[PDB]
Design a binder for these strands. Structure first.
Ligand SMILES: [Mg+2]
Ligand SMILES: [Mg+2]
Ligand SMILES: [Mg+2]
Ligand SMILES: [Mg+2]
Ligand SMILES: [Mg+2]
Ligand SMILES: [Mg+2]
Ligand SMILES: [Mg+2]
Ligand SMILES: [Mg+2]
Ligand SMILES: [Mg+2]
Ligand SMILES: [Mg+2]
Ligand SMILES: [Mg+2]
Ligand SMILES: [Mg+2]
Ligand SMILES: [Mg+2]
Ligand SMILES: [Mg+2]
Ligand SMILES: [Mg+2]
Ligand SMILES: [Mg+2]
Ligand SMILES: [Mg+2]
Ligand SMILES: [Mg+2]
Ligand SMILES: [Mg+2]
Ligand SMILES: [Mg+2]
Ligand SMILES: [Mg+2]
Ligand SMILES: [Mg+2]
Ligand SMILES: [Mg+2]
Ligand SMILES: [Mg+2]
Ligand SMILES: [Mg+2]
Ligand SMILES: [Mg+2]
Ligand SMILES: [Mg+2]
Ligand SMILES: [Mg+2]
Ligand SMILES: [Mg+2]
Ligand SMILES: [Mg+2]
Ligand SMILES: [Mg+2]
Ligand SMILES: [Mg+2]
Ligand SMILES: [Mg+2]
Ligand SMILES: [Mg+2]
Ligand SMILES: [Mg+2]
Ligand SMILES: [Mg+2]
Ligand SMILES: [Mg+2]
Ligand SMILES: [Mg+2]
Ligand SMILES: [Mg+2]
Ligand SMILES: [Mg+2]
Ligand SMILES: [Mg+2]
Ligand SMILES: [Mg+2]
Ligand SMILES: [Mg+2]
Ligand SMILES: [Mg+2]
Ligand SMILES: [Mg+2]
Ligand SMILES: [Mg+2]
Ligand SMILES: [Mg+2]
Ligand SMILES: [Mg+2]
Ligand SMILES: [Mg+2]
Ligand SMILES: [Mg+2]
Ligand SMILES: [Mg+2]
Ligand SMILES: [Mg+2]
Ligand SMILES: [Mg+2]
Ligand SMILES: [Mg+2]
Ligand SMILES: [Mg+2]
Ligand SMILES: [Mg+2]
Ligand SMILES: [Mg+2]
Ligand SMILES: [Mg+2]
Ligand SMILES: [Mg+2]
Ligand SMILES: [Mg+2]
Ligand SMILES: [Mg+2]
Ligand SMILES: [Mg+2]
Ligand SMILES: [Mg+2]
Ligand SMILES: [Mg+2]
Ligand SMILES: [Mg+2]
Ligand SMILES: [Mg+2]
Ligand SMILES: [Mg+2]
Ligand SMILES: [Mg+2]
Ligand SMILES: [Mg+2]
Ligand SMILES: [Mg+2]
Ligand SMILES: [Mg+2]
Ligand SMILES: [Mg+2]
Ligand SMILES: [Mg+2]
Ligand SMILES: [Mg+2]
Ligand SMILES: [Mg+2]
Ligand SMILES: [Mg+2]
Ligand SMILES: [Mg+2]
Ligand SMILES: [Mg+2]
Ligand SMILES: [Mg+2]
Ligand SMILES: [Mg+2]
Ligand SMILES: [Mg+2]
Ligand SMILES: [Mg+2]
Ligand SMILES: [Mg+2]
Ligand SMILES: [Mg+2]
Ligand SMILES: [Mg+2]
Ligand SMILES: [Mg+2]
Ligand SMILES: [Mg+2]
Ligand SMILES: [Mg+2]
Ligand SMILES: [Mg+2]
Ligand SMILES: [Mg+2]
Ligand SMILES: [Mg+2]
Ligand SMILES: [Mg+2]
Ligand SMILES: [Mg+2]
Ligand SMILES: [Mg+2]
Ligand SMILES: [Mg+2]
Ligand SMILES: [Mg+2]
Ligand SMILES: [Mg+2]
Ligand SMILES: [Mg+2]
Ligand SMILES: [Mg+2]
Ligand SMILES: [Mg+2]
Ligand SMILES: [Mg+2]
Ligand SMILES: [Mg+2]
Ligand SMILES: [Mg+2]
Ligand SMILES: [Mg+2]
Ligand SMILES: [Mg+2]
Ligand SMILES: [Mg+2]
Ligand SMILES: [Mg+2]
Ligand SMILES: [Mg+2]
Ligand SMILES: [Mg+2]
Ligand SMILES: [Mg+2]
Ligand SMILES: [Mg+2]
Ligand SMILES: [Mg+2]
Ligand SMILES: [Mg+2]
Ligand SMILES: [Mg+2]
Ligand SMILES: [Mg+2]
Ligand SMILES: [Mg+2]
Ligand SMILES: [Mg+2]
Ligand SMILES: [Mg+2]
Ligand SMILES: [Mg+2]
Ligand SMILES: [Mg+2]
Ligand SMILES: [Mg+2]
Ligand SMILES: [Mg+2]
Ligand SMILES: [Mg+2]
Ligand SMILES: [Mg+2]
Ligand SMILES: [Mg+2]
Ligand SMILES: [Mg+2]
Ligand SMILES: [Mg+2]
Ligand SMILES: [Mg+2]
Ligand SMILES: [Mg+2]
Ligand SMILES: [Mg+2]
Ligand SMILES: [Mg+2]
Ligand SMILES: [Mg+2]
Ligand SMILES: [Mg+2]
Ligand SMILES: [Mg+2]
Ligand SMILES: [Mg+2]
Ligand SMILES: [Mg+2]
Ligand SMILES: [Mg+2]
Ligand SMILES: [Mg+2]
Ligand SMILES: [Mg+2]
Ligand SMILES: [Mg+2]
Ligand SMILES: [Mg+2]
Ligand SMILES: [Mg+2]
Ligand SMILES: [Mg+2]
Ligand SMILES: [Mg+2]
Ligand SMILES: [Mg+2]
Ligand SMILES: [Mg+2]
Ligand SMILES: [Mg+2]
Ligand SMILES: [Mg+2]
Ligand SMILES: [Mg+2]
Ligand SMILES: [Mg+2]
Ligand SMILES: [Mg+2]
Ligand SMILES: [Mg+2]
Ligand SMILES: [Mg+2]
Ligand SMILES: [Mg+2]
Ligand SMILES: [Mg+2]
Ligand SMILES: [Mg+2]
Ligand SMILES: [Mg+2]
Ligand SMILES: [Mg+2]
Ligand SMILES: [Mg+2]
Ligand SMILES: [Mg+2]
Ligand SMILES: [Mg+2]
Ligand SMILES: [Mg+2]
Ligand SMILES: [Mg+2]
Ligand SMILES: [Mg+2]
Ligand SMILES: [Mg+2]
Ligand SMILES: [Mg+2]
Ligand SMILES: [Mg+2]
Ligand SMILES: [Mg+2]
Ligand SMILES: [Mg+2]
Ligand SMILES: [Mg+2]
Ligand SMILES: [Mg+2]
Ligand SMILES: [Mg+2]
Ligand SMILES: [Mg+2]
Ligand SMILES: [Mg+2]
Ligand SMILES: [Mg+2]
Ligand SMILES: [Mg+2]
Ligand SMILES: [Mg+2]
Ligand SMILES: [Mg+2]
Ligand SMILES: [Mg+2]
Ligand SMILES: [Mg+2]
Ligand SMILES: [Mg+2]
Ligand SMILES: [Mg+2]
Ligand SMILES: [Mg+2]
Ligand SMILES: [Mg+2]
Ligand SMILES: [Mg+2]
Ligand SMILES: [Mg+2]
Ligand SMILES: [Mg+2]
Ligand SMILES: [Mg+2]
Ligand SMILES: [Mg+2]
Ligand SMILES: [Mg+2]
Ligand SMILES: [Mg+2]
Ligand SMILES: [Mg+2]
Ligand SMILES: [Mg+2]
Ligand SMILES: [Mg+2]
Ligand SMILES: [Mg+2]
Ligand SMILES: [Mg+2]
Ligand SMILES: [Mg+2]
Ligand SMILES: [Mg+2]
Ligand SMILES: [Mg+2]
Ligand SMILES: [Mg+2]
Ligand SMILES: [Mg+2]
Ligand SMILES: [Mg+2]
Ligand SMILES: [Mg+2]
Ligand SMILES: [Mg+2]
Ligand SMILES: [Mg+2]
Ligand SMILES: [Mg+2]
Ligand SMILES: [Mg+2]
Ligand SMILES: [Mg+2]
Ligand SMILES: [Mg+2]
Ligand SMILES: [Mg+2]
Lengths: 47, 272
RNA sequence: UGGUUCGUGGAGCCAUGGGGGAAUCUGGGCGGACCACCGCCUAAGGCUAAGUACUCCGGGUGACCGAUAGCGCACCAGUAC
RNA sequence: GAGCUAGCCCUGGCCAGGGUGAAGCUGGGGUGAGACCCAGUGGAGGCCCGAACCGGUGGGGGAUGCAAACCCCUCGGAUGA
RNA sequence: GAAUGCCGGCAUGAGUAACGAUAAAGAGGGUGAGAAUCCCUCUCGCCGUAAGCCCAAGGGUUCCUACGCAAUGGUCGUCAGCGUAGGGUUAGGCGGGACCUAAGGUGAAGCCGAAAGGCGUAGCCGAAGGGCAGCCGGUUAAUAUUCCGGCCCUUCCCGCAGGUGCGAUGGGGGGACGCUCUAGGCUAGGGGGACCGGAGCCAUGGACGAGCCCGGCCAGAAGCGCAGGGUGGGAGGUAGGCAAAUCCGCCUCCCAACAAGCUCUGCGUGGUGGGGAAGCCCGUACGGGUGACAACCCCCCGAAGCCAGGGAGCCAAGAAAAGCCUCUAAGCACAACCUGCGGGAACCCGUACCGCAAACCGACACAGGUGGGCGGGUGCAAGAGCACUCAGGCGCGCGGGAGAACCCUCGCCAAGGAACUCUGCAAGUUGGCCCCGUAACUUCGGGAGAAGGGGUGCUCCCUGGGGUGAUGAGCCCCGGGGAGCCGCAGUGAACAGGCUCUGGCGACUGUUUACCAAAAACACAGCUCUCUGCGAACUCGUAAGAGGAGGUAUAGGGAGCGACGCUUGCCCGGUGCCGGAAGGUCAAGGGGAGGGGUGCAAGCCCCGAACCGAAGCCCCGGUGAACGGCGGCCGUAACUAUAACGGUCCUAAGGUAGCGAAAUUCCUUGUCGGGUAAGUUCCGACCUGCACGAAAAGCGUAACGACCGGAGCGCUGUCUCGGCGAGGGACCCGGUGAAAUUGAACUGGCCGUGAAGAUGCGGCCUACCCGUGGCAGGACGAAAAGACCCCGUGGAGCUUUACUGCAGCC
RNA sequence: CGAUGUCGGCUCGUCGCAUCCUGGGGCUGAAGAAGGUCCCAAGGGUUGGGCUGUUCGCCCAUUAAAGCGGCACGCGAGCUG
RNA sequence: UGGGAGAGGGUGGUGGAAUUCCCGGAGUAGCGGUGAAAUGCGCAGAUACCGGGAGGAACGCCGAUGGCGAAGGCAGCCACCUGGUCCACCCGUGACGCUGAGGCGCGAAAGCGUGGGGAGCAAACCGGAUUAGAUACCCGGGUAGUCCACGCCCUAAACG
């Protein structure tokens, strides 16, 4: 039956992506934590 | 004049629609329509604030003149009477002799072809708008401003009518359609006639869905709820009200007044 | 109302949100309600190193560990997944 | 976190083929005028039978399964909430 | 050495279950070290509104080719969607952007918020919506509406030629719109053909024949033709479209009433361009040559597609903005714009491949899930249904045997038909179309496919209607009558209701517990109560703001009941709510009688009684479709019996109508009657209502119901009572190969014993060692630190006249 | 209580006897036939239905009889539910 | 043809007295009510008086043994629409007439459906008296109804 992950490159970039991290003051602290962690991808890779 | 139905489905046993006999024009004036935002009850936060709305037929909004001191002295020929979906009344299309076209809402007993005019010096005759200080006392009247130049607030629904019962000084005394008696300022315009489509309140919708076409969604009783959802909720078995009967938000709904008590309007209000 | 050891207590001192509302040295605050005496300071403008805290980084040392230990990673790890 | 799910807003799409035959028209009958009654036309409906589509009634299978909700027979709606 | 301990490693089950749809396989020949599994040929089966093509999302090299087989592939592998390497994706016209706007998002002005931030007109962003210029073939191993060939277009920019007051992000028109049903004419698509073109073939009894088989097209400017859509033309007057207008709008006379005229599409024809089967011959895996100088004609069916903004009807009354046209404003009128021609200019991204699936979402080459378009033919009345089958694609990536029990999915059955059982659960009967015929009841619609019947194929003859063609032949759609033929059987296969009587609940269609409940629960039209005069009440928010609503008492919110019919009685003492400018009490505040502490005193600082002090509560009334409530004991009537009647206690009042052993009845299988041979259920009654009862409604009610109960008819493997048969497993062999569980094990019965249910203790009995197919009594068998019970001064959810606070309101 | 699945039905039995029938016997208020009561005796047998979830029970029609109990109120890694 | 009377009917409009309620002033210790009392209303300022406002229903005197209509029935006034009827002139048609099974229409009051309206009265209902008891008569409250529009019902001591 219809499972949970039904992917969409529009929705993935507009929700999790970098320009929508940096609206929100919570979301800037996301990238701050991932930089301080040292992640190789601060945002989810869409194409 | 209300048109009924043979019972050839179960819903068509009781369903009544209106006659649409006064309607002369089936399609609205292009320069006077603009789209209704359907809202769904949902405010600018996205939250429901009025429950059980949505799903309606799509509507274009008809721009109504509720002012009519805009165009004092300039008479207008009644060109069409139309259906407005956004209101219980019909609407009347006016061709002014300018060639400004406006909608007004339709009184009882307008004809197409006839002439109306606003004015302090207009004839006291159906469709004309005067100040309230110039209409003779005892006329029924509609489209009534509450405070002057703020536009028509009072007696707008289908069939409704207010009656002038006096003057007192600057102020005149209206029997409102609630039966409230109220002092309204004399320079507030008002438009004589009762409102037509007075057979609106005999429409029996017939089935569930005709509520839904108007965007009235299903209404859920609080007795069918659970006690997080509603005061009336819960109870193994059916439940009497258990408590004084109550809104979802806690306050009583058999008797409790909530006219705000220190309101400055209440010095203008005689009875209720 | 908050701060101070001070939780209304005999409750001062310091900062205050609301109301009333002075004076310029014979003027004002304070010394734990208050008053007198005796004393101590001069509010309602601001600036000021050093002595103090920390360790992303460099260095030295260890009755610290030695690949299930030591950082999560000694190894292209915040990776694969 | 509303890419599952619930509700709403904007913009598009889909519903094979059959039945029944409301109103209203036209002719006729009727009357002072009517209501009304026959045909014929008409094509209404949260109407009927039934695929796509949406479901999930009863039974059987499955039970470390094809499947962390499935499969077969059967069944409900299918121009509308 | 133990913590159902952590990490790792390896064992047991065990060569056990399984190898992922029962759509199906067999042989011959090649390669190869090795073939059931790779390639080729023949035969067979499966899909064929797909299991076949084309888009979009998602995926991201999986595409093609060459060399390979360690691992991936549920076996094998020479193969591959795998490893290595190389190649492959070409656009002014397709999709998206240098165009526009929708919900929404953002947001200069401005509003708000301790900070972070929250709103917000214009503007900007925002697309499967609007706008816009490309059709047909050919090449590659792999791309093409992208390259090539033919034909045809759109923007710009610069020139000349001819016309005109040109001219804006500004005004106006337009764009521009619903649902259902439709007319006319086309096209797509398909059927037939003696006509046309074809390699060929007479087979096995007959046929050289209007024989059999294949194919008889596609695109195409201008110009015609045929359908069809949009549109009035002048003259004045004008204060409205926030400046101005000749435009638009509104008046007033004149010619049309039409598409006559203008344009604008669609469809035929069209210069010319291209394609071209079956069969045969081959050398690849895939394609080529010939057949061909190919023919490329005529009828019929015909769309849901086109003309498109068509027409009619209906209520629930059906986006915006730009492109486009028109109108003026500054500016300009050596400009600028329009039409024609020529020359020049035309960017950025995607394009391979899978795409109902082995490449997307499900950890897997997973029987699940995934939006749009084409989806042929014949028959069954129609259809996207069902059966077979064109093109095309498959035989589902373990096989070979055997022919036990047992399981799954099928088929049949003597005699009996529900005796089975909680229950006809399941399975069977019925089944499509045509024609007779059809009851109570009813809201007059229904009930109705009621029920129950008859027909159903084929041949010949006669015969009536339409559509296309000329009224005619043919071709197609419909019928009627008569005479016959065959079989057990004529919707001869597949798809296709079992029916009736009766009660309960809910009026009805609908909705829900994704993943054990589809119901009598929710919702529903409809009824009532109550609030709300608009900066409304209510809701979200600290606020700003927003919904309500761009609504205005025929409207909006809240509560209950829940179509409809007949009805909704009594109690206002307590609680709620509503109305009372009196009175009791009531905080801050006012007020200071009087008293206190200090001073040598002026003073400074304290308490502090009368009295004035709101809401609220007390108090006075009202209020039931507000919360709720609606009795007990005695006696009495010409036979018992019973009580119409009376006496009495208490209450605020003491259950009215109507129902009643009920979804309510403990006693209870109450007691009568009906059904049955027999009826704790069912139906109809009585009332002794433990403990119905009027909007948490009362009593009924046609129709409706995958709801719940009773009964009968038809029919049957449900049963008496089983039997046989088929296939997929089970069993044997070859290939791959798990699992939970496991203290170790050399693991028998009885009678006792033991922590009270012993393979292990005692006595006796029995018993060589080891497997395989089976059955489940035991190992207090597995799985889950029992979910029922209790405990813990454990936790959450919910309630209230528990306590204490807070938002809110006064 | 780091789990001993609870009623009733089906299937399958097996055991006890304090025996329902059948067999042997004593007493009888045993004339005969049929009975009553007690003793011996388990080898075998111990029906099909209506009602109800029922066990039990009540009826229908038979029978030689329509027996009572145990085996975790036998029996759910056997089934139903 | 020319006149006459009439509450004959339908529609629209309008005038005054009185009852009730609300507001303002003044004003006291009681008002209603009955056979008599009581319930009830009233120092929270009632009844009795004056002034203003709203609302509904019925129209005193004229007015009666009167008029009109087929019956039911019809009463302030104004206008519109309309039926019936009577007299006079004797002008026209020329027997065109009477009754009337069915049918059709009208049809007080009460009652019913939808909406409106509701001042007074008033079934049911609630109190207070009478009585042995009162589900009645009397008294104080009070809902349908009585009123309007539309659609039903179709009755009677519809009686001369
Ligand atoms: Mg518009
Ligand atoms: Mg917003
Ligand atoms: Mg937001
Ligand atoms: Mg509801
Ligand atoms: Mg509930
Ligand atoms: Mg919640
Ligand atoms: Mg609550
Ligand atoms: Mg409750
Ligand atoms: Mg209950
Ligand atoms: Mg403190
Ligand atoms: Mg403090
Ligand atoms: Mg303390
Ligand atoms: Mg302190
Ligand atoms: Mg201060
Ligand atoms: Mg201050
Ligand atoms: Mg101080
Ligand atoms: Mg000090
Ligand atoms: Mg001090
Ligand atoms: Mg001191
Ligand atoms: Mg000091
Ligand atoms: Mg200073
Ligand atoms: Mg360092
Ligand atoms: Mg060491
Ligand atoms: Mg480590
Ligand atoms: Mg090591
Ligand atoms: Mg580590
Ligand atoms: Mg969603
Ligand atoms: Mg259809
Ligand atoms: Mg008809
Ligand atoms: Mg139809
Ligand atoms: Mg339907
Ligand atoms: Mg159906
Ligand atoms: Mg489709
Ligand atoms: Mg779905
Ligand atoms: Mg569902
Ligand atoms: Mg199912
Ligand atoms: Mg199941
Ligand atoms: Mg179905
Ligand atoms: Mg059905
Ligand atoms: Mg130990
Ligand atoms: Mg260990
Ligand atoms: Mg381990
Ligand atoms: Mg092993
Ligand atoms: Mg083996
Ligand atoms: Mg084994
Ligand atoms: Mg085995
Ligand atoms: Mg096996
Ligand atoms: Mg060889
Ligand atoms: Mg797309
Ligand atoms: Mg893509
Ligand atoms: Mg993938
Ligand atoms: Mg790769
Ligand atoms: Mg190769
Ligand atoms: Mg391999
Ligand atoms: Mg290698
Ligand atoms: Mg392999
Ligand atoms: Mg696999
Ligand atoms: Mg090889
Ligand atoms: Mg490949
Ligand atoms: Mg490869
Ligand atoms: Mg550019
Ligand atoms: Mg550019
Ligand atoms: Mg743009
Ligand atoms: Mg834009
Ligand atoms: Mg914002
Ligand atoms: Mg800021
Ligand atoms: Mg906005
Ligand atoms: Mg677009
Ligand atoms: Mg588009
Ligand atoms: Mg394009
Ligand atoms: Mg092509
Ligand atoms: Mg390709
Ligand atoms: Mg080209
Ligand atoms: Mg111009
Ligand atoms: Mg425009
Ligand atoms: Mg415009
Ligand atoms: Mg054709
Ligand atoms: Mg030929
Ligand atoms: Mg031969
Ligand atoms: Mg052909
Ligand atoms: Mg063609
Ligand atoms: Mg052509
Ligand atoms: Mg004109
Ligand atoms: Mg102007
Ligand atoms: Mg015409
Ligand atoms: Mg042409
Ligand atoms: Mg060829
Ligand atoms: Mg060929
Ligand atoms: Mg149209
Ligand atoms: Mg714009
Ligand atoms: Mg491409
Ligand atoms: Mg491609
Ligand atoms: Mg598809
Ligand atoms: Mg997959
Ligand atoms: Mg899965
Ligand atoms: Mg995969
Ligand atoms: Mg596979
Ligand atoms: Mg799959
Ligand atoms: Mg399926
Ligand atoms: Mg699908
Ligand atoms: Mg087709
Ligand atoms: Mg077909
Ligand atoms: Mg046939
Ligand atoms: Mg056919
Ligand atoms: Mg058919
Ligand atoms: Mg189709
Ligand atoms: Mg099919
Ligand atoms: Mg084939
Ligand atoms: Mg397989
Ligand atoms: Mg046979
Ligand atoms: Mg049989
Ligand atoms: Mg037989
Ligand atoms: Mg039989
Ligand atoms: Mg039985
Ligand atoms: Mg039985
Ligand atoms: Mg039954
Ligand atoms: Mg069944
Ligand atoms: Mg049959
Ligand atoms: Mg029935
Ligand atoms: Mg019928
Ligand atoms: Mg039949
Ligand atoms: Mg035959
Ligand atoms: Mg034709
Ligand atoms: Mg013809
Ligand atoms: Mg026959
Ligand atoms: Mg069938
Ligand atoms: Mg019952
Ligand atoms: Mg229902
Ligand atoms: Mg009912
Ligand atoms: Mg239905
Ligand atoms: Mg249903
Ligand atoms: Mg469920
Ligand atoms: Mg679940
Ligand atoms: Mg279910
Ligand atoms: Mg009702
Ligand atoms: Mg109503
Ligand atoms: Mg708030
Ligand atoms: Mg607002
Ligand atoms: Mg608004
Ligand atoms: Mg309301
Ligand atoms: Mg409401
Ligand atoms: Mg209810
Ligand atoms: Mg009910
Ligand atoms: Mg009825
Ligand atoms: Mg009641
Ligand atoms: Mg009460
Ligand atoms: Mg009360
Ligand atoms: Mg009271
Ligand atoms: Mg009060
Ligand atoms: Mg005080
Ligand atoms: Mg004081
Ligand atoms: Mg004081
Ligand atoms: Mg007070
Ligand atoms: Mg007696
Ligand atoms: Mg008594
Ligand atoms: Mg009573
Ligand atoms: Mg009974
Ligand atoms: Mg009997
Ligand atoms: Mg009997
Ligand atoms: Mg009985
Ligand atoms: Mg009964
Ligand atoms: Mg009873
Ligand atoms: Mg009871
Ligand atoms: Mg009840
Ligand atoms: Mg009750
Ligand atoms: Mg009630
Ligand atoms: Mg009932
Ligand atoms: Mg019923
Ligand atoms: Mg029924
Ligand atoms: Mg059987
Ligand atoms: Mg068998
Ligand atoms: Mg077999
Ligand atoms: Mg093997
Ligand atoms: Mg033992
Ligand atoms: Mg032993
Ligand atoms: Mg031992
Ligand atoms: Mg064994
Ligand atoms: Mg065992
Ligand atoms: Mg087994
Ligand atoms: Mg066991
Ligand atoms: Mg266990
Ligand atoms: Mg435990
Ligand atoms: Mg539980
Ligand atoms: Mg405790
Ligand atoms: Mg606790
Ligand atoms: Mg507060
Ligand atoms: Mg236990
Ligand atoms: Mg254990
Ligand atoms: Mg014995
Ligand atoms: Mg014996
Ligand atoms: Mg004997
Ligand atoms: Mg004897
Ligand atoms: Mg004897
Ligand atoms: Mg029976
Ligand atoms: Mg039974
Ligand atoms: Mg028992
Ligand atoms: Mg036994
Ligand atoms: Mg026991
Ligand atoms: Mg047991
Ligand atoms: Mg059991
Ligand atoms: Mg069950
Ligand atoms: Mg159960
Ligand atoms: Mg004469
Ligand atoms: Mg004669
Ligand atoms: Mg009457
Ligand atoms: Mg009456
Ligand atoms: Mg009435
Ligand atoms: Mg009275
Ligand atoms: Mg009275
Ligand atoms: Mg009389």
């Amino acid at each position: 039956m219809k499972r949970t992950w039904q992917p969409n490159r529009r929705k993935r970039a507009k929700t999790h992506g970098f320009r929508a991290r940096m609206r929100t003051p919570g979301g800037r602290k996301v990238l701050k934590r991932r930089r301080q962690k040292g992640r190789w991808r601060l945002t989810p890779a869409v194409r | 004049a209300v048109k009924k139905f043979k019972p050839y489905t179960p819903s068509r046993r009781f369903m009544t629609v209106a006659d649409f006999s006064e309607i002369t024009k089936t399609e609205p004036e292009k320069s006077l329509v603009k789209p209704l935002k359907k809202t769904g009850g949902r405010n600018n936060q996205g939250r429901i604030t009025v429950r059980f709305r949505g799903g309606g037929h799509k509507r274009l909004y008809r721009i109504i003149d509720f002012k009519r001191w805009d165009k004092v002295g300039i008479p207008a020929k009644v060109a069409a009477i139309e259906y407005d979906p956004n209101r219980s009344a019909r609407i009347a299309l006016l061709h002014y002799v300018d060639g400004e076209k406006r909608y007004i809402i339709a009184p009882d007993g307008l004809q197409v072809g006839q002439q109306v005019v606003a004015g302090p010096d207009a004839p006291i005759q159906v469709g004309n708008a005067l100040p309230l200080r110039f209409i003779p006392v005892g006329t029924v009247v509609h489209a009534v401003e509450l405070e002057p130049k703020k536009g028509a607030k009072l007696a707008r629904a289908a069939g409704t009518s207010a009656q002038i019962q006096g003057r007192e000084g600057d102020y005149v005394i209206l029997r409102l359609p609630s039966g409230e008696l109220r002092k309204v300022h004399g320079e507030c315009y008002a438009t004589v006639g009762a409102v037509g489509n007075a057979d609106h309140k005999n429409i029996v919708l017939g089935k569930a869905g005709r509520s839904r076409w108007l965007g009235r969604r299903p209404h859920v009783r609080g007795a069918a709820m659970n006690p997080v959802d509603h005061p009336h909720g819960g109870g193994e078995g059916r439940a009497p009200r258990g408590r004084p009967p109550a809104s979802p938000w806690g306050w009583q709904t058999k008797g409790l007044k909530t006219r705000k008590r220190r309101k400055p309007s209440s010095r203008f209000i005689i009875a209720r």
